């Protein structure tokens, strides 16, 4: 596992992990074993703690810290508390008669491990939320600490993303295969696969209506839509069985219409309209995101639909993915940092219709040099990426959370000369869901 000794290496702390996942019901407990020597503890006891520390920049740091967790393990049993776990008990396999363990628990609504990025000349201040398991030995809790008697680990809490999206992806690939198919066999196989995917998706529930009742009217409408979709798949499959491939392809093209019906109901969209004087008709703009939950590094494709009847041409399209970070503290300020920018010289004739799909990807390596970003750890570490979006409170408090991180996509249209019309699409970025010893030191 992982270990780390004090500057006076007479006190060694082990842990089963360095990163702990947040289950909304209950975070995993912290299991560890404390190895000491009673001779150096002639009249003294070893201590363990856990705090949700706050950092900035006696290191010239302002602090607003709130959590306490106490389990002392010398002797290990004042009372036989022992809510034991398998690895914690088995860790005595190689450890002698001084190794007494500990067990901790984290509240299920604490903020995750987020850290803002400062710099020599930064657009934002330095702040962060991080956890620490600190161990030490002295006569009592209130006694002054010392550096030759301390081990201070730093652990991390991570939220992982929560079937319908996979089913829709399968349907999209099967539809493309259907369009590109040339014989009846591939058509039939694709139709079978999409029928299975559509049924499986109909068995599921959408994220937006989760709080509503299972028998609520919205769920009825959703299942009705998937019923229509499966019926159209059935018609295409029957035509494919008859062998007439072209009619099957048209019946599959009808699935485009039913998918368009589903999208405007259950996917992020936005539409703003603007008009000017000395004209007759206004300008209309629309955009849509394919999905809501995104994975770090997964490209984001942004549909753009534009129509116009004005007397002005437009040759510019700008698509961006913008950071948004909150600081729920006394220094309250708000931030916005484009993580990925896009530019094309596409066409807006005075009277014409345009629709193309553009793909973007927020990535830290290309976007590193700017300051004030939102990260989840030290930049030097390999497991450090951008900050996953702060899952909003389920009606809980906001001030105590500290740092809220969110993402949304902007599409801008550059009005020609003789504001610039824009839409926004909120979305979500998240990470996808004997003993050998090692050192904890990062």
């Amino acid at each position: 596992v992982f270990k780390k000794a004090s500057p006076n290496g007479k006190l060694t702390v082990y842990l089963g992990k360095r990163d702990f996942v947040d289950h909304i019901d209950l975070v995993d407990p912290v299991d560890g074993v404390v190895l000491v020597d009673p001779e150096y503890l002639k009249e003294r006891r070893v201590y363990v703690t856990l705090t949700c520390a706050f950092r900035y920049g006696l290191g010239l740091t302002f602090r607003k810290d709130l959590f306490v967790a106490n389990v002392q393990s010398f002797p290990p049993a004042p009372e036989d508390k022992k809510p034991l776990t398998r690895l914690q008990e088995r860790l005595i396999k190689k450890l002698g008669e001084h190794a007494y363990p500990f067990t901790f628990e984290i509240p299920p609504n604490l903020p995750c491990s987020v850290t803002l990025q400062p710099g020599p000349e930064d657009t934002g201040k330095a702040c962060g939320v991080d956890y620490e398991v600190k161990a030490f030995c002295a006569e009592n809790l209130e006694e002054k600490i010392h550096k030759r008697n301390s081990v201070r680990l730093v652990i991390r809490k991570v939220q992982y993303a929560p079937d319908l999206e996979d089913n829709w992806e399968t349907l999209n690939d099967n539809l493309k295969v259907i369009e590109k198919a040339d014989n009846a066999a591939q058509v039939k196989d694709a139709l079978t696969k999409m029928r299975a995917a559509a049924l499986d998706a109909q068995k599921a529930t959408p994220p937006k209506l989760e709080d509503k009742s299972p028998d609520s009217p919205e769920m009825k409408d959703f299942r009705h839509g998937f019923d229509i979709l499966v019926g159209q798949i059935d018609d295409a499959l029957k035509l494919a069985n008859e062998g007439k491939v072209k009619e099957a392809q048209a019946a599959a093209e009808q699935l485009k219409t039913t998918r368009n019906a589903y999208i405007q109901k259950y996917l992020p969209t936005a539409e703003t309209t603007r008009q000017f004087l000395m004209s007759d008709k206004p300008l209309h703009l629309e955009a849509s995101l394919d999905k809501e939950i995104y994975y770090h590094g997964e490209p984001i494709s942004v549909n753009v639909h534009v129509t116009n009847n004005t007397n002005k041409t437009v040759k510019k399209i700008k698509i961006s993915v913008r950071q948004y970070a909150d600081i729920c503290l006394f220094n309250t300020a708000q931030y916005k940092c484009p993580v990925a920018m896009e530019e094309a010289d596409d066409t807006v004739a005075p009277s014409s219709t345009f629709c193309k799909v553009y793909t973007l990807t927020p990535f830290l390596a290309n976007n590193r040099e700017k300051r004030g970003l939102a990260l989840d750890g030290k930049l030097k570490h390999e497991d450090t990426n951008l900050a996953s979006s702060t899952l909003l409170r389920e009606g809980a408090n906001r001030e105590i959370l500290g740092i809220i991180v969110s993402y949304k996509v902007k599409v801008k249209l550059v009005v020609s000369r003789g504001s610039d019309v824009a839409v926004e699409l909120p979305f979500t970025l998240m990470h996808p869901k004997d003993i050998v010893f090692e050192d904890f030191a990062r």
Partner: antibody
Framework: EVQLVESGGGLVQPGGSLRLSCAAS????????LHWVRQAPGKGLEWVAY????????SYADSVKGRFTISADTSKNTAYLQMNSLRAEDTAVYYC?????????????????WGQGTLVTVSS | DIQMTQSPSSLSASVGDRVTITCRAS??????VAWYQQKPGKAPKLLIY???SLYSGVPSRFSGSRSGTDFTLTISSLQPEDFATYYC??????????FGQGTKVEIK
């Protein structure tokens, strides 16, 4: 009540023809689909063919693709199966089964009401 | 064609014991699996449809569970009617129906 009466079996020389009739009572054929499920003696069940009277669509099996012919009759609540050039492998007892339509529970309940079955035998 | 296979080709159990019968799909069929209990020389009977749901009339000591593409059935066997061959059918589409090789529950 629901009863799937299946009759029309017998012994036929190789290359001969037979007409297996599946009569239904207690429900009209215009509301459900009708299949055929084989059973070889001492083996598992096997799918044969089916018909749906709401669309006239029929599909057969890879073993009896070019030989059998299925046709329904709404006014009599019977769906006819036609045997042509029966081989030796078709010496199996045949069942008639009913399957609902897509929208709703009936599709999910696959083959809720079967038939007693008739036995056909092919020998030289 | 979607293929159905039953692994425990024969089971031996006595009255009152617990019996489990498995099935494994070769392709993703969202539920769409039904189990039939074929008595010696009798037509199949519908026990469990939708891969988990019960059919009215069938006794209550029958249940199923789906995990990925693997389907299982569980009984608390009684004397008269729980000793026969059981089957596993996939019914995704009208012209895609394939049955599984049966399994027999003898008496020790």
């Amino acid at each position: 009540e629901v009863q799937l009466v299946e009759s029309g079996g017998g012994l036929v020389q190789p290359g001969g023809s037979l007409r297996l009739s599946c009569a239904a009572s207690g429900f009209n054929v215009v509301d459900f689909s009708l299949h055929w499920v084989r059973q070889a003696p001492g083996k598992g069940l096997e799918w044969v063919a089916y018909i749906s009277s709401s669309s006239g669509s029929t599909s057969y099996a890879d073993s009896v693709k070019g030989r059998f012919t299925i046709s329904a009759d709404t006014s009599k609540n019977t769906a006819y199966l036609q045997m042509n050039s029966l081989r030796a492998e078709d010496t199996a007892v045949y069942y008639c089964a009913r399957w609902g339509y897509w929208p709703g529970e009936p599709w999910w309940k696959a083959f809720d009401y079967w038939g007693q079955g008739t036995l056909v035998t092919v020998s030289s | 064609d979607i293929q159905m296979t039953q692994s425990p080709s024969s089971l031996s159990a006595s009255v009152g014991d617990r019996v489990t019968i498995t099935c494994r799909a070769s392709q993703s069929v969202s539920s769409a699996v039904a189990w039939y209990q074929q008595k010696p020389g009798k037509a199949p009977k519908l026990l469990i449809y939708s891969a988990s749901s019960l059919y009215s009339g069938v006794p209550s000591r029958f249940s199923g569970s789906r995990s990925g593409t693997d389907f299982t059935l569980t009984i608390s066997s009684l004397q008269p009617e729980d000793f026969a061959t059981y089957y596993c059918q996939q019914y995704l589409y009208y012209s895609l129906v394939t049955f599984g090789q049966g399994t027999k529950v003898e008496i020790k």
